[PDB]
Design a protein around this ligand. Structure first.
Ligand code: FMN
Ligand code: MN
Ligand code: MN
Ligand code: MN
Ligand code: MN
Ligand code: OH
Ligand code: OH
Lengths: 132, 283, 284
């Protein structure tokens, strides 16, 4: 399964839609819990502080991952962002990957190109086949 | 008509607060980057390599002068929220900071005669003047959605024709402190392009299907018009040093990113946007 | 057509001087810890609280006008490319000024208090009138009159409200809020000088007939804005009995606005002798 977060601009939401894999969204308001394991897809958001903790992870994601039941079933993280942010490029995946035991699977920019959708589909399929 | 006092305790769009916090939290001035340490690196460049860099920098300065003095301010009446107006004033100011930082680099590294030749070049170069006429036309015209497309294409595409050079020098361990300065600019442009493109999409939702289709045609028409002109601008500058084919890859790479800011899908294939990785490592 | 700005050749060093000062004084409302005023704020009357919030909302409107409309409307009338850059900074800093008041409101006041304060600015005829006056010239055609209206806003209209936070500071109340306002006044002072300075330079480019028409305009617009501000002041300060002194402060700043435009002072010294406690709060 896939768990993704996207802000009001929904660049990440539209990428998960192009993926075609069924996935559940971390709501902009409120908390949720997941049952089946999942991979996390989130964008990166610096906040004037910059310098890559330090954040970069949406607060809704922090709440979702602060859930012990939700964090336990996390398997991997894919971060979105934009290379024009220098060292902060997709650093949210670095934060989630480092602050947990999960690996850093992929990075892409904004809605992702056609190559990103094909890359995440095949990579995520071979990843799930590995867990076994 | 009448204006109402801005109440930041009632936001119609949380993105305005998010963008305001990031942009103002990233406040900087050219005096913050110590360009003086680049004096040895600068002296190692050819007269032509110096000339190429100064002209590219002057071209970036014009895009900044245009976006701060005309672009951002012209977006204020098309705001969706009063806080969007406040954000736009910050963009207008930071653009002036961007344009000034190049005069800082020039003051530390270059001579007065070298600077005069650089600014004289920007006045006479038809391609640089052409891209300015194109965006200025839509900034000063009407049609608010077309203005935002032209603005987003400026922030996410037109600049990166010149952003390539400071990244190139950084990949060669030259002008590294200046690259730090330019990196601060690119970080701001990314947010500017994201925000204005985000607002463009918000305005697209308020129009009918016919208008929406007319604007998708417009974006592609203006992108290729600006791109065809940018390739000329790129060729004349980088052909001497043999970087044109890679700068063009970088151009198509960011053109796709500019399209996505406007909610549109990427256009150029992977084999046309595979810029030399050394340049991306500088990013 | 536009030309890239070259900061290494200034036609007027004053642009560089003002840019350096304004950017060197950069600040954001999060820098002033208004939370320390919560005990002080609780000591004010319901009327004193409402008076303070309305005065602040009135300042917020002036800043909203000056940042989104005022400063930007001056850009096409710039004499040098660097003057334009300065104006963008003023436009941004004005938005910061208007934001700082929402900061104070967020730390000290309730939601119902804030809504009631903003609702007042919409219905108050005098506040709306002074906004209509400056907006008319901001959006108009005559650029020299636009600079006169702007200077009167920066150097005169604001100080009708700046009086109150200085009054509280002089009584050891809302001192942190006063520190915020002092940061605002530091910017306004420079703005009025700069725009008035540019107004004077623009005056030199017209004929004596036009210059005479503008002096008539300045006194006439000052008389209109002053008569309107006294109504604004009475309705606000009559409750607490501060009107007589705020009027002194009005003439005090009206003279400063006039001199920023190169014109002679209008009110005599015996009419601008504001209580020294208020003037002491403006200075360190
Ligand atoms: C305020 C702000 C800060 C951002 N900071 C970063 C960053 O530090 N690193 C990065 O790679 N992208 C950064 N981005 C880019 C976003 O991650 C990118 O636009 C992404 O597609 C947003 O996805 P979403 O639409 O689902 O929110 C930032 C964007 C905004 C608006
Ligand atoms: Mn810029
Ligand atoms: Mn920009
Ligand atoms: Mn102000
Ligand atoms: Mn001001
Ligand atoms: O730039
Ligand atoms: O103010």
């Amino acid at each position: 399964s896939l768990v993704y977060f996207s802000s009001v601009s929904e660049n990440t939401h539209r990428f998960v839609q192009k993926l075609g894999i069924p996935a559940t969204r971390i709501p902009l308001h409120g908390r949720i819990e997941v049952d089946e394991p999942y991979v996390l897809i989130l964008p990166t958001y610096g906040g004037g502080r910059a310098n890559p903790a330090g954040g970069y992870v949406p607060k809704q994601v922090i709440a979702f991952l602060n859930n012990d039941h939700n964090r336990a079933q996390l398997r991997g993280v894919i971060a979105a962002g934009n290379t024009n942010f220098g060292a902060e490029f997709c650093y949210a995946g670095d934060v989630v990957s480092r602050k947990c035991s999960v690996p850093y699977l992929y990075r892409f920019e904004l809605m992702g190109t056609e190559d990103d959708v094909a890359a995440v589909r095949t990579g995520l399929a071979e990843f799930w086949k590995e867990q076994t | 008509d009448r204006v109402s006092a801005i109440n930041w305790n009632r936001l119609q769009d949380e993105k305005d607060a998010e963008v305001w916090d990031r942009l103002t939290g990233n406040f900087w001035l050219p005096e913050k980057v110590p360009v003086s340490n680049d004096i040895p690196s600068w002296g190692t460049l050819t007269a032509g390599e110096k000339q190429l860099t100064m002209r590219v920098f002057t071209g970036l300065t014009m895009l900044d002068t245009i976006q701060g003095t005309v672009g951002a301010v012209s977006l204020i009446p098309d705001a969706l929220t009063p806080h969007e107006e406040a954000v736009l004033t910050n963009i207008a100011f930071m653009e002036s900071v961007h344009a000034k930082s190049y005069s800082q680099i020039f003051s530390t590294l270059c001579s007065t005669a070298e600077i005069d030749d650089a600014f004289r070049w920007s006045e006479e170069n038809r391609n640089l003047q052409r891209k300015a006429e194109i965006v200025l036309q839509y900034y000063r015209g009407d049609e608010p959605l077309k203005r935002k497309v032209a603005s987003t294409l400026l922030e996410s595409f037109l600049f990166y024709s010149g952003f390539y050079l400071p990244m190139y020098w950084s990949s060669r361990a030259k002008l590294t402190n200046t690259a730090d300065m330019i990196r601060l600019i690119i970080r701001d442009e990314a947010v500017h392009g994201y925000y204005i493109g985000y607002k463009f999409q918000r305005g697209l939702a308020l129009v009918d299907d016919v208008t929406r289709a007319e604007l998708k045609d417009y974006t592609y028409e203006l992108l290729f018009e600006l791109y065809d002109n940018e390739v000329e601008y790129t060729q004349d500058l980088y052909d001497e040093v043999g970087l044109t084919e890679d700068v063009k890859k970088f151009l198509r790479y960011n053109a796709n990113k500019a399209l996505m800011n406007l909610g549109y899908e990427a256009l150029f294939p992977r084999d046309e946007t595979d810029v030399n990785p050394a340049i991306l490592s500088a990013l």
